Amino acid sequence: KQALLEVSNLVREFPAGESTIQILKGIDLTIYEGELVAIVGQSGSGKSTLMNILGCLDRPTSGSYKVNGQETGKLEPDQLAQLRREYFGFIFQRYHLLGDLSAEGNVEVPAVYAGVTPADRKQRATALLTELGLGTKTQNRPSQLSGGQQQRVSIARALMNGGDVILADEPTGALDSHSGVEVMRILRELNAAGHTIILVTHDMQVAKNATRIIEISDGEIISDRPNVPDQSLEEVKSDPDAAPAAWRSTLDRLSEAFQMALLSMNAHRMRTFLTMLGIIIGIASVVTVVALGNGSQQQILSNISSLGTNTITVFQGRGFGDNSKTANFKTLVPADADALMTQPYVSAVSPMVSTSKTMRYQQNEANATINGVSNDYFDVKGLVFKDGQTFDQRSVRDRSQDVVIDTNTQKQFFSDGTNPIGQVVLLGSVPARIIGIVEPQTSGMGSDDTLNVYMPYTTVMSRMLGQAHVRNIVVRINDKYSTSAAENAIVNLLTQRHGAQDIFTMNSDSIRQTIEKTTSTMTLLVSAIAVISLVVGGIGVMNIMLVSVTERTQEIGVRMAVGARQSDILQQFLIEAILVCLIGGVLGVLLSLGLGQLINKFAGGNFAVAYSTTSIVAAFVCSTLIGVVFGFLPAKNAAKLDPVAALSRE
Amino acid sequence: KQALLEVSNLVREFPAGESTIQILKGIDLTIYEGELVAIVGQSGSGKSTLMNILGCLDRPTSGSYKVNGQETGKLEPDQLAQLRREYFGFIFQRYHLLGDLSAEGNVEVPAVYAGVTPADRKQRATALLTELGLGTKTQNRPSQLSGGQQQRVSIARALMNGGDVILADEPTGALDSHSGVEVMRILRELNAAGHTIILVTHDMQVAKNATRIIEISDGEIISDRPNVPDQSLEEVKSDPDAAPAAWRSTLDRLSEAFQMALLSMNAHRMRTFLTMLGIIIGIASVVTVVALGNGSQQQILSNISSLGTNTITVFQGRGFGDNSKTANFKTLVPADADALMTQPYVSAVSPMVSTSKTMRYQQNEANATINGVSNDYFDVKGLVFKDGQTFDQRSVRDRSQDVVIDTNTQKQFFSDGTNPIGQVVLLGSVPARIIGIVEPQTSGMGSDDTLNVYMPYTTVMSRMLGQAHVRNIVVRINDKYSTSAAENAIVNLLTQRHGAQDIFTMNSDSIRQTIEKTTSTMTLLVSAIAVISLVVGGIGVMNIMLVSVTERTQEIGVRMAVGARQSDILQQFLIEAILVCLIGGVLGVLLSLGLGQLINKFAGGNFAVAYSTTSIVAAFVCSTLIGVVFGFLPAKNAAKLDPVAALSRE
């Protein structure tokens, strides 16, 4: 028949100085189930390398080691991990425990990396910890336990997956005489229950506890020989301790990884909040700058929407410097607008003049801008009437005091819901009857904020201003038929009619396009100086995750020796980085929101901030990608660690 | 007389569960110089607490401990540090060494904090390491040494400041039988030389190496008693080992802190380059943005530097057409300039007209801008003549073909060094003789470009263009009067002289002023989106330093135990952060430079980058301040650690 542990011709060469050295010189050994073995030797003998190979933490590399008939010489890390989970459990001199978890958690870890019900492993965990006398200390964390207590914890952990072969590296080397007697007694009782126990030690008095003492020096076994410890008379073995034993599952273990990362974040908070804080600052700056640019383009377009579509406007210079030069040198007259009206390219034309007067309705008064306009004006500027009607050509000609108001004026005087149409307000000293209401241009506030009122320009000029000239003339170019050449033919036409070239011309579509270009581009470059430099300046996640790997290299080694797959470590650290970046992106979004509603307070009427709902989705996605990226290299470096070198590193 | 170590009724309490517990009950001890003492007890007895107090790492809270007649009960941390450096040296179970330093360095550390010459301490370090058999291993790092070898290193370290009282925790607890005999024999040999040695242990077989065995349980000494070890005959001495005992020094401690921070940086490289890298990106982005803005303001001012200082320009005209229906409406005539000349506010006036023609000198062809101007023109635009003279009022009147050239045209045709004055080139079909050379408006060597040439405006209008009108008229404002009132009187004046308001005017000083305002504030905002978001988003230095304090807590404890002052730890980590920020702030400056010389290629004439030499100084200063700010909190957290808790944390 075949023994459990079958060692044939193990040669382990570790290279040193462009040459190889044999730490194991061709050892043959056979250990059957249930046997109590102490491998004893001095430092450099090869005892601990031999144990590493026995524990499937290392390969022969020349020879054969068969665990229950399975050769490990060619096996790959996850296969050796399988053998660890099924057959082996470990105990170390300094009794490595996870400072984050508790006793029950440390005990659970091996069950976690195997397939286990989270309820069931709580049952076995608390059960084993109770058998070993820690029942009251179940919830204690390693910093809260003594040396002996921690070593008993790691015993329970080794027994979680059944402890078929328990490998103890100098288990009493760290702790005192009493807890040493207890650890040794617990092991001997476990062997009495049938556990194969192999303890490696440099102390002969320690090796006395075994029934079989193998002695190793300079990579060869010099002695192996039966032994009966004398304390078997001391301990009659009264109180019995017997405790022997790609679709689907990656969901389950990935969930486990989520709680591993989550509780590890909860353990270390301050560092989570700082690394996360960089990303909060980053996403906040990104969304703040992008949304500020979007809202400022939107604002300055709706603020300049006072022009309209396909509208060429015609101005004058000053012509002042005296009040005689007013009636002299102001040459733009409504006759010019009438002339423009008969042109083939003009769909609509209006003159315009304005004055500020006190608008009174009943007891309420206010200050309003009164705009003398043609009845065509609402067509050219593109205003749509909420309720009423415009004037007529008849009413423009007859100097009607019919008046049109905008939504803001309705809000001012008629807040009662009383229909303003038909109501007679007074503008200055001139009464007016409201024939219509207009919904204005702007999206948000803007600069208006101002009460607009429209009367026929004839009535404003004659009844109010007392002037023969027009402030400016707006035209809607029909068909968009040579929209630029219309402006040119307009200046040619009025320059003929005037004595000289008296008139400035302003193209609305070109002004809008220029504003959109400049705002869009500068929002792009400023937002790049935010995004690229900041979020890319959030590499610190990578750095802190690298230092988190170097920190936990022992934790990683213990995880692997307890049966962690490389995939399991990688998923743990990727899920940690991903989760930190995701949550810190959510807080970056919220900081950007509240910060933006703060920036709406500031005096800029040109500055507004508009949050694109597809820049928020892009924010979450990009933050999570920062997690998956930086973010990656440490999560892979951890899973690629050598569990031997990882376990012994300090 | 009084013995070295005098303990009288020391009671050491710790709070447990909202109540106090006595770990040390009233203990009396007297240890004279030269005694070999083993304090032996089990875990919880109070033995290691008693040692901590003996080592001046902790205070009794009840009672007295006098080191050579000096009560430590009320002493402050730097005072206890003094006593450590003067009297004590330490040895720990796991033989704590600094993985960064070598054997010689670890041995030096106590001498380092004791104010010793690096030459002298190198001698004593190598001497002690040779005495203990490490002479060949002198340069090895702890990772390169065996357990016994490392413990021998820490022995030499304890002997550095003289090892009057050597306090050993379990010295053999980590290491095997042979190296145990070696370490323990070395101790007995040191006591033979007169070293007071106190070794605390949980193992009686270890305690028997001492001549005096004190035994302690539940905070009291149950036994104290002489002992003669049997190994005194087994150890015969063939090699007696006897090695017993203003403005200045703060600069020394800063030098040491600089050296060790530097070597620690050299130890961990990837961490350093990543931590820096954020600040390299940050400083690069700030200096790039500010220098881009300064250079773009520099260009957009030099692009509008085609105007003068205190220079009002007068334009007109848009549409094409006939000689009748267009040229009749061109009202700018040199007569307008003559009228302006007699005004009190006008220092100089020139009209201006331009045409592009092919300039030929000998075999060279080129294309030049030909500017009809008044002889006053160089006065108003502020051009200075490199060599020759301007025209005369007679030559302007007489349609002279005398011509003035700028530096660029000289560079083109006369690159032979041939004096251009007197030479006859031809402009188009019109020959001209050069009477003068002008140094242009350029700020920088990329602004100027095109070849300017100036003839009297009369000659250009009549001989070339065939037009009666002037493209525009430039006016320099005398008295340095109000340029706005100048515009007002100019527009009134030419508006009266013309039929109507025919003329547009540009104020040069106001345009320049506006460009400077908007560019400056704009770049301040964008550079704030760099700095505020980036360098402040470079908190990660603080985080890495903070976890670097965590990882080094044992290193910090050992340093304090060898005599480190809190100030010394503070200087170490604060100087580390400072150097991390400064180095890489310089690399951020260099990255910004190279990026700027990249942007000088790929960018147009509006984008240029000009690096202010007072923005680089500000870069170094600000980076170092980021060090002194963010690095501080960790550097303080390290210096405030309890050496007891720091040593036993893991």
PDB file of C-alpha atoms in Angstrom, chain A residues 32-240:
ATOM      1  CA  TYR A  32       2.011   7.320   7.289  1.00  0.00           C
ATOM      2  CA  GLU A  33      -1.293   8.724   8.525  1.00  0.00           C
ATOM      3  CA  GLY A  34      -1.522   9.341  12.262  1.00  0.00           C
ATOM      4  CA  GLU A  35       2.214   9.495  12.960  1.00  0.00           C
ATOM      5  CA  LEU A  36       3.776  12.102  15.276  1.00  0.00           C
ATOM      6  CA  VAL A  37       6.970  13.310  13.602  1.00  0.00           C
ATOM      7  CA  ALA A  38       9.531  15.867  14.774  1.00  0.00           C
ATOM      8  CA  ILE A  39      12.040  16.949  12.138  1.00  0.00           C
ATOM      9  CA  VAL A  40      14.908  18.438  14.144  1.00  0.00           C
ATOM     10  CA  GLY A  41      18.047  20.175  12.920  1.00  0.00           C
ATOM     11  CA  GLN A  42      20.075  23.326  13.262  1.00  0.00           C
ATOM     12  CA  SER A  43      19.909  26.509  11.209  1.00  0.00           C
ATOM     13  CA  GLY A  44      20.915  25.728   7.631  1.00  0.00           C
ATOM     14  CA  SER A  45      20.269  21.986   7.897  1.00  0.00           C
ATOM     15  CA  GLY A  46      17.386  22.111   5.424  1.00  0.00           C
ATOM     16  CA  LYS A  47      14.628  21.268   7.901  1.00  0.00           C
ATOM     17  CA  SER A  48      12.349  24.211   7.095  1.00  0.00           C
ATOM     18  CA  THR A  49      12.797  23.883   3.327  1.00  0.00           C
ATOM     19  CA  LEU A  50      11.852  20.218   3.713  1.00  0.00           C
ATOM     20  CA  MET A  51       8.748  21.294   5.626  1.00  0.00           C
ATOM     21  CA  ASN A  52       7.899  23.853   2.935  1.00  0.00           C
ATOM     22  CA  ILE A  53       7.970  21.056   0.361  1.00  0.00           C
ATOM     23  CA  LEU A  54       5.919  18.802   2.655  1.00  0.00           C
ATOM     24  CA  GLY A  55       3.309  21.572   2.883  1.00  0.00           C
ATOM     25  CA  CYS A  56       3.087  21.968  -0.907  1.00  0.00           C
ATOM     26  CA  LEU A  57       4.532  25.483  -0.604  1.00  0.00           C
ATOM     27  CA  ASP A  58       7.511  24.452  -2.747  1.00  0.00           C
ATOM     28  CA  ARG A  59       8.598  21.848  -5.300  1.00  0.00           C
ATOM     29  CA  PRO A  60      11.317  19.162  -4.904  1.00  0.00           C
ATOM     30  CA  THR A  61      12.693  20.324  -7.476  1.00  0.00           C
ATOM     31  CA  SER A  62      14.470  17.088  -8.409  1.00  0.00           C
ATOM     32  CA  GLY A  63      12.810  14.065  -6.847  1.00  0.00           C
ATOM     33  CA  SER A  64       9.284  12.991  -5.985  1.00  0.00           C
ATOM     34  CA  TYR A  65       6.924  14.035  -3.208  1.00  0.00           C
ATOM     35  CA  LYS A  66       3.547  12.286  -3.316  1.00  0.00           C
ATOM     36  CA  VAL A  67       0.722  13.395  -1.034  1.00  0.00           C
ATOM     37  CA  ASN A  68      -1.660  10.408  -0.926  1.00  0.00           C
ATOM     38  CA  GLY A  69      -0.299   9.295  -4.291  1.00  0.00           C
ATOM     39  CA  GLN A  70      -0.185  12.723  -5.967  1.00  0.00           C
ATOM     40  CA  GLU A  71       3.139  13.988  -7.322  1.00  0.00           C
ATOM     41  CA  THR A  72       3.664  17.694  -6.601  1.00  0.00           C
ATOM     42  CA  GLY A  73       6.839  18.031  -8.676  1.00  0.00           C
ATOM     43  CA  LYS A  74       5.017  19.408 -11.725  1.00  0.00           C
ATOM     44  CA  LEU A  75       2.006  20.956  -9.973  1.00  0.00           C
ATOM     45  CA  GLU A  76       1.065  24.635 -10.526  1.00  0.00           C
ATOM     46  CA  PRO A  77       0.219  27.112  -7.728  1.00  0.00           C
ATOM     47  CA  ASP A  78      -3.560  26.561  -7.692  1.00  0.00           C
ATOM     48  CA  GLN A  79      -3.085  22.773  -7.654  1.00  0.00           C
ATOM     49  CA  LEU A  80      -0.697  22.975  -4.700  1.00  0.00           C
ATOM     50  CA  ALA A  81      -3.257  25.317  -3.130  1.00  0.00           C
ATOM     51  CA  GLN A  82      -5.841  22.559  -3.589  1.00  0.00           C
ATOM     52  CA  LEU A  83      -3.591  20.059  -1.811  1.00  0.00           C
ATOM     53  CA  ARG A  84      -3.108  22.607   0.978  1.00  0.00           C
ATOM     54  CA  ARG A  85      -6.843  23.123   1.449  1.00  0.00           C
ATOM     55  CA  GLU A  86      -7.692  19.433   1.486  1.00  0.00           C
ATOM     56  CA  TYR A  87      -4.799  17.795   3.360  1.00  0.00           C
ATOM     57  CA  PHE A  88      -2.704  20.366   5.215  1.00  0.00           C
ATOM     58  CA  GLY A  89      -2.975  23.048   7.840  1.00  0.00           C
ATOM     59  CA  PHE A  90      -0.186  25.161   9.221  1.00  0.00           C
ATOM     60  CA  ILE A  91       1.152  26.563  12.490  1.00  0.00           C
ATOM     61  CA  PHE A  92       4.078  28.991  12.595  1.00  0.00           C
ATOM     62  CA  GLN A  93       6.583  29.970  15.281  1.00  0.00           C
ATOM     63  CA  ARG A  94       5.358  33.554  15.487  1.00  0.00           C
ATOM     64  CA  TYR A  95       1.764  32.317  14.883  1.00  0.00           C
ATOM     65  CA  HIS A  96       0.779  34.594  12.041  1.00  0.00           C
ATOM     66  CA  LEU A  97      -2.758  35.897  12.496  1.00  0.00           C
ATOM     67  CA  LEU A  98      -4.640  38.579  10.599  1.00  0.00           C
ATOM     68  CA  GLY A  99      -4.679  41.713  12.735  1.00  0.00           C
ATOM     69  CA  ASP A 100      -7.774  42.932  10.895  1.00  0.00           C
ATOM     70  CA  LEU A 101      -9.969  39.889  11.546  1.00  0.00           C
ATOM     71  CA  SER A 102     -10.964  38.395  14.896  1.00  0.00           C
ATOM     72  CA  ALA A 103     -10.300  34.923  16.278  1.00  0.00           C
ATOM     73  CA  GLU A 104     -13.447  33.555  14.634  1.00  0.00           C
ATOM     74  CA  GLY A 105     -12.479  35.242  11.363  1.00  0.00           C
ATOM     75  CA  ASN A 106      -8.904  33.954  11.292  1.00  0.00           C
ATOM     76  CA  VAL A 107     -10.330  30.499  11.956  1.00  0.00           C
ATOM     77  CA  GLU A 108     -12.831  31.009   9.119  1.00  0.00           C
ATOM     78  CA  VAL A 109     -10.272  32.032   6.448  1.00  0.00           C
ATOM     79  CA  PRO A 110      -9.402  28.475   5.272  1.00  0.00           C
ATOM     80  CA  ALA A 111     -13.080  27.590   5.026  1.00  0.00           C
ATOM     81  CA  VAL A 112     -13.561  30.858   3.116  1.00  0.00           C
ATOM     82  CA  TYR A 113     -11.051  29.954   0.417  1.00  0.00           C
ATOM     83  CA  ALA A 114     -12.647  26.522   0.140  1.00  0.00           C
ATOM     84  CA  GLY A 115     -16.294  26.087  -0.709  1.00  0.00           C
ATOM     85  CA  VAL A 116     -18.129  26.676   2.580  1.00  0.00           C
ATOM     86  CA  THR A 117     -21.470  27.995   3.741  1.00  0.00           C
ATOM     87  CA  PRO A 118     -20.816  31.248   5.664  1.00  0.00           C
ATOM     88  CA  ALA A 119     -23.209  29.979   8.351  1.00  0.00           C
ATOM     89  CA  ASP A 120     -21.501  26.582   8.581  1.00  0.00           C
ATOM     90  CA  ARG A 121     -18.008  28.046   8.920  1.00  0.00           C
ATOM     91  CA  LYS A 122     -19.266  30.268  11.734  1.00  0.00           C
ATOM     92  CA  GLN A 123     -20.534  27.085  13.392  1.00  0.00           C
ATOM     93  CA  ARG A 124     -17.247  25.182  13.045  1.00  0.00           C
ATOM     94  CA  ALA A 125     -15.187  28.285  13.864  1.00  0.00           C
ATOM     95  CA  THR A 126     -16.913  28.991  17.176  1.00  0.00           C
ATOM     96  CA  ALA A 127     -16.975  25.245  17.895  1.00  0.00           C
ATOM     97  CA  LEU A 128     -13.227  24.716  17.430  1.00  0.00           C
ATOM     98  CA  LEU A 129     -12.391  27.916  19.313  1.00  0.00           C
ATOM     99  CA  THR A 130     -14.593  26.687  22.164  1.00  0.00           C
ATOM    100  CA  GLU A 131     -12.886  23.267  22.222  1.00  0.00           C
ATOM    101  CA  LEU A 132      -9.513  25.014  22.612  1.00  0.00           C
ATOM    102  CA  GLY A 133     -10.785  27.199  25.467  1.00  0.00           C
ATOM    103  CA  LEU A 134     -11.230  30.486  23.587  1.00  0.00           C
ATOM    104  CA  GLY A 135     -15.043  30.390  23.706  1.00  0.00           C
ATOM    105  CA  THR A 136     -15.151  33.600  25.737  1.00  0.00           C
ATOM    106  CA  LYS A 137     -12.403  35.195  23.616  1.00  0.00           C
ATOM    107  CA  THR A 138     -14.211  34.317  20.334  1.00  0.00           C
ATOM    108  CA  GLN A 139     -14.601  37.951  19.282  1.00  0.00           C
ATOM    109  CA  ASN A 140     -11.114  39.096  20.294  1.00  0.00           C
ATOM    110  CA  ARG A 141      -8.733  40.461  17.668  1.00  0.00           C
ATOM    111  CA  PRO A 142      -5.097  39.200  17.610  1.00  0.00           C
ATOM    112  CA  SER A 143      -3.794  42.351  19.327  1.00  0.00           C
ATOM    113  CA  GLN A 144      -6.191  41.425  22.166  1.00  0.00           C
ATOM    114  CA  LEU A 145      -4.825  37.892  22.715  1.00  0.00           C
ATOM    115  CA  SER A 146      -1.708  36.507  24.364  1.00  0.00           C
ATOM    116  CA  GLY A 147       0.902  34.411  22.594  1.00  0.00           C
ATOM    117  CA  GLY A 148      -0.529  31.118  23.785  1.00  0.00           C
ATOM    118  CA  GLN A 149      -4.046  32.289  22.974  1.00  0.00           C
ATOM    119  CA  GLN A 150      -3.072  33.321  19.444  1.00  0.00           C
ATOM    120  CA  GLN A 151      -1.284  30.010  18.892  1.00  0.00           C
ATOM    121  CA  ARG A 152      -4.430  28.153  19.977  1.00  0.00           C
ATOM    122  CA  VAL A 153      -6.346  30.332  17.506  1.00  0.00           C
ATOM    123  CA  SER A 154      -4.012  29.248  14.696  1.00  0.00           C
ATOM    124  CA  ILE A 155      -4.458  25.641  15.841  1.00  0.00           C
ATOM    125  CA  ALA A 156      -8.225  26.014  15.416  1.00  0.00           C
ATOM    126  CA  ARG A 157      -7.530  27.592  12.019  1.00  0.00           C
ATOM    127  CA  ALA A 158      -5.382  24.631  10.966  1.00  0.00           C
ATOM    128  CA  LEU A 159      -8.229  22.322  12.048  1.00  0.00           C
ATOM    129  CA  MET A 160     -10.856  24.228  10.015  1.00  0.00           C
ATOM    130  CA  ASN A 161     -10.264  22.302   6.786  1.00  0.00           C
ATOM    131  CA  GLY A 162      -9.673  19.188   8.887  1.00  0.00           C
ATOM    132  CA  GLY A 163      -5.971  19.299   9.730  1.00  0.00           C
ATOM    133  CA  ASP A 164      -5.162  15.949   8.133  1.00  0.00           C
ATOM    134  CA  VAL A 165      -1.483  16.936   8.259  1.00  0.00           C
ATOM    135  CA  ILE A 166      -0.695  19.770  10.675  1.00  0.00           C
ATOM    136  CA  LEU A 167       2.743  21.271  10.010  1.00  0.00           C
ATOM    137  CA  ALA A 168       4.132  23.256  12.958  1.00  0.00           C
ATOM    138  CA  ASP A 169       7.279  25.350  12.467  1.00  0.00           C
ATOM    139  CA  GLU A 170       8.879  25.779  15.930  1.00  0.00           C
ATOM    140  CA  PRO A 171       5.428  26.301  17.480  1.00  0.00           C
ATOM    141  CA  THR A 172       6.761  26.832  21.019  1.00  0.00           C
ATOM    142  CA  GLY A 173       9.681  29.053  19.997  1.00  0.00           C
ATOM    143  CA  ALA A 174       7.757  32.273  20.558  1.00  0.00           C
ATOM    144  CA  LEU A 175       5.981  31.427  23.812  1.00  0.00           C
ATOM    145  CA  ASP A 176       6.706  30.498  27.414  1.00  0.00           C
ATOM    146  CA  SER A 177       6.796  27.238  29.377  1.00  0.00           C
ATOM    147  CA  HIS A 178       3.130  27.006  30.419  1.00  0.00           C
ATOM    148  CA  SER A 179       1.616  27.907  27.051  1.00  0.00           C
ATOM    149  CA  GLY A 180       4.263  25.675  25.488  1.00  0.00           C
ATOM    150  CA  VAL A 181       3.042  22.721  27.532  1.00  0.00           C
ATOM    151  CA  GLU A 182      -0.498  23.601  26.462  1.00  0.00           C
ATOM    152  CA  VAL A 183       0.287  23.894  22.738  1.00  0.00           C
ATOM    153  CA  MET A 184       2.247  20.635  22.798  1.00  0.00           C
ATOM    154  CA  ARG A 185      -0.467  18.904  24.801  1.00  0.00           C
ATOM    155  CA  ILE A 186      -3.088  20.073  22.294  1.00  0.00           C
ATOM    156  CA  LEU A 187      -1.034  18.718  19.394  1.00  0.00           C
ATOM    157  CA  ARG A 188      -0.413  15.362  21.080  1.00  0.00           C
ATOM    158  CA  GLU A 189      -4.149  15.062  21.785  1.00  0.00           C
ATOM    159  CA  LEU A 190      -4.891  15.854  18.137  1.00  0.00           C
ATOM    160  CA  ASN A 191      -2.537  13.040  17.131  1.00  0.00           C
ATOM    161  CA  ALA A 192      -4.271  10.795  19.660  1.00  0.00           C
ATOM    162  CA  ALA A 193      -7.358  11.639  17.606  1.00  0.00           C
ATOM    163  CA  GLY A 194      -5.472  10.594  14.451  1.00  0.00           C
ATOM    164  CA  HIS A 195      -4.085  13.877  13.108  1.00  0.00           C
ATOM    165  CA  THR A 196      -0.795  13.462  11.289  1.00  0.00           C
ATOM    166  CA  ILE A 197       1.423  16.067  12.962  1.00  0.00           C
ATOM    167  CA  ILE A 198       4.865  17.077  11.702  1.00  0.00           C
ATOM    168  CA  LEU A 199       6.669  19.640  13.852  1.00  0.00           C
ATOM    169  CA  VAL A 200      10.032  21.016  12.729  1.00  0.00           C
ATOM    170  CA  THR A 201      12.303  22.377  15.439  1.00  0.00           C
ATOM    171  CA  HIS A 202      15.860  23.315  16.330  1.00  0.00           C
ATOM    172  CA  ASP A 203      15.348  22.266  19.976  1.00  0.00           C
ATOM    173  CA  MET A 204      15.848  18.635  20.983  1.00  0.00           C
ATOM    174  CA  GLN A 205      13.757  19.050  24.130  1.00  0.00           C
ATOM    175  CA  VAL A 206      10.929  20.197  21.850  1.00  0.00           C
ATOM    176  CA  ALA A 207      11.405  17.233  19.501  1.00  0.00           C
ATOM    177  CA  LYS A 208      11.045  15.009  22.589  1.00  0.00           C
ATOM    178  CA  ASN A 209       7.272  15.561  22.391  1.00  0.00           C
ATOM    179  CA  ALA A 210       7.079  13.481  19.191  1.00  0.00           C
ATOM    180  CA  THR A 211       6.803   9.705  18.999  1.00  0.00           C
ATOM    181  CA  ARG A 212       9.225   9.702  16.036  1.00  0.00           C
ATOM    182  CA  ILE A 213      12.283  11.966  15.927  1.00  0.00           C
ATOM    183  CA  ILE A 214      13.892  12.520  12.526  1.00  0.00           C
ATOM    184  CA  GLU A 215      17.194  14.398  12.671  1.00  0.00           C
ATOM    185  CA  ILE A 216      18.564  16.327   9.698  1.00  0.00           C
ATOM    186  CA  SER A 217      21.903  18.032   9.126  1.00  0.00           C
ATOM    187  CA  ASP A 218      23.516  19.569   6.032  1.00  0.00           C
ATOM    188  CA  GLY A 219      20.609  18.515   3.841  1.00  0.00           C
ATOM    189  CA  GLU A 220      20.513  14.848   4.864  1.00  0.00           C
ATOM    190  CA  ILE A 221      18.633  12.934   7.550  1.00  0.00           C
ATOM    191  CA  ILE A 222      21.220  11.534   9.949  1.00  0.00           C
ATOM    192  CA  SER A 223      18.750   9.993  12.416  1.00  0.00           C
ATOM    193  CA  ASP A 224      15.166   8.811  12.611  1.00  0.00           C
ATOM    194  CA  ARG A 225      14.070   6.738  15.561  1.00  0.00           C
ATOM    195  CA  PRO A 226      11.117   6.039  17.885  1.00  0.00           C
ATOM    196  CA  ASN A 227      10.557   8.048  21.056  1.00  0.00           C
ATOM    197  CA  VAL A 228       8.252   7.880  24.065  1.00  0.00           C
ATOM    198  CA  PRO A 229       7.864  11.222  25.892  1.00  0.00           C
ATOM    199  CA  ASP A 230       8.023  10.992  29.674  1.00  0.00           C
ATOM    200  CA  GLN A 231       5.082  13.347  30.255  1.00  0.00           C
ATOM    201  CA  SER A 232       2.739  10.705  28.829  1.00  0.00           C
ATOM    202  CA  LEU A 233       2.790   9.598  32.476  1.00  0.00           C
ATOM    203  CA  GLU A 234       2.074  13.183  33.582  1.00  0.00           C
ATOM    204  CA  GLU A 235      -0.869  13.583  31.199  1.00  0.00           C
ATOM    205  CA  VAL A 236      -2.997  10.427  31.352  1.00  0.00           C
ATOM    206  CA  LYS A 237      -5.156  11.888  28.551  1.00  0.00           C
ATOM    207  CA  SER A 238      -8.332  12.481  30.574  1.00  0.00           C
ATOM    208  CA  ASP A 239     -10.316  15.299  28.920  1.00  0.00           C
ATOM    209  CA  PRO A 240     -10.855  14.096  25.334  1.00  0.00           C
TER     210      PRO A 240
END
